[PDB]
Amino acid sequence: DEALAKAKGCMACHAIDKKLVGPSYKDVAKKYTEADVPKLVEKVKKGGAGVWGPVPMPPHPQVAEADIEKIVRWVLTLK
Numbered sequence: 048d049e050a051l052a053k054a055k056g057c058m059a060c061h062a063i064d065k066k067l068v069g070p071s072y073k074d075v076a077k078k079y080t081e082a083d084v085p086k087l088v089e090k091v092k093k094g095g096a097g098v099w100g101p102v103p104m105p106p107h108p109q110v111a112e113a114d115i116e117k118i119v120r121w122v123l124t125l126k
């Protein structure tokens with residue numbers, strides 16, 4: 048949910064309705080659906096670049112994959 052995203056440092060680089068370093072969560076929800084959850088979860092975990100730009104999202108080797116999936120399913124409901 049939102050409190051979890053913020054507890055895991057996500058909202059330093061992402062906001063619901065505007066762009067910061069990474070895409071807005073509303074743009075992420077517009078690009079993907081619940082079909083894509085497994086793919087997004089790997090991206091947050093392993094990090095990486097190129098889908099939205101050249102600046103990489105760092106890996107998250109110490110955030111539980113269960114928590115990441117929670118944040119990701121919530122991101123996707125922001126329409």
Ligand code: HEC
Nearest residue numbers: 055057060068069090095096097098099100102103104118
């Ligand atoms: C900067 C220090 C970041 C923090 C911390 C987090 N994210 Fe991020 N994210 C960042 C960038 C620069 C990008 C674009 C990467 C690219 O391919 O261009 C992203 C991307 C995402 C995405 C979209 C993934 C994709 O479309 O391939 C999601 C769903 C996302 N980020 C979620 C997310 C979560 C849940 C974070 C906290 C656990 C998190 N990000 C941190 C920059 C940064």
